[PDB]
Amino acid sequence: MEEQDARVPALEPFRVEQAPPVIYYVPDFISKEEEEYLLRQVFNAPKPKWTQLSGRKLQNWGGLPHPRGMVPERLPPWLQRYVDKVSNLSLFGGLPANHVLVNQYLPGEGIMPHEDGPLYYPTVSTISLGSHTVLDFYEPRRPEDDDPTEQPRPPPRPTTSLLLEPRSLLVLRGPAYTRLLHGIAAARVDALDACLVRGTRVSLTIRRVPRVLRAGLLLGK
Numbered sequence: 001m002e003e004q005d006a007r008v009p010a011l012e013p014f015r016v017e018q019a020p021p022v023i024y025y026v027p028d029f030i031s032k033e034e035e036e037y038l039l040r041q042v043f044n045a046p047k048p049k050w051t052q053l054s055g056r057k058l059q060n061w062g063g064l065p066h067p068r069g070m071v072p073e074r075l076p077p078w079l080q081r082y083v084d085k086v087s088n089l090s091l092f093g094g095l096p097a098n099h100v101l102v103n104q105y106l107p108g109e110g111i112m113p114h115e116d117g118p119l120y121y122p123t124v125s126t127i128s129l130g131s132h133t134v135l136d137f138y139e140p141r142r143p144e145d146d147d148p149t150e151q152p153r154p155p156p157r158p159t160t161s162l163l164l165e166p167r168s169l170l171v172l173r174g175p176a177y178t179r180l181l182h183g184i185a186a187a188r189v190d191a192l193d194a195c196l197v198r199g200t201r202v203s204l205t206i207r208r209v210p211r212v213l214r215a216g217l218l219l220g221k
């Protein structure tokens, strides 16, 4: 039922059939002119919009997701345009997305394997800009599968990897959101067999945050 409910009829021509349920990959979701304008607006944002992490830089737009409730911020039109385009595919349970995470990866930067978790409706939509990357998928270790007497097992390798080209839309739903981990290796090149050199990548991850505080209300803790 999880897989059945996760299907989006309008995107079925874009289903990645050999990947876990349910992954869509739409090439050329945005034009080169649209890509250029998004890069310009990310790069020209006020310095304080940027957060420096150990292995990448990012921007939050729409507010900072939090388990006690998100304090919302108005999305600017240059992002709302694409929030509207992905929300029109009805990817977020029948309410529009309300949050954009911008990640910037210089060549050699990535993101450790993770699941996006319960702060979001269980759907990732990502518009890639600037450079290709490879997104790796891993089977999680579930507590119900824990065997403290198991034979030696090789270090985890990805179960599937997907090339993400600039101007593509990626959608992860069902088990691809709730069961699998995804990550990007800290690499300068991706061998397909032939081989792609990474430039700077900027990704726009568009999600719906269901726990939002009314305008003006703060929670401590």
Ligand SMILES: O=C(O)CCC(=O)C(=O)O
Pocket (backbone or CB within 6 Å): 101, 103, 111, 116, 126, 182, 203, 205
């Ligand atoms: O940059 C990407 O496409 C993935 C980012 C991501 O997985 C995340 O920020 O949760």
Ligand SMILES: [Mn+2]
Pocket (backbone or CB within 6 Å): 114, 115, 116, 182
């Ligand atoms: Mn993620």
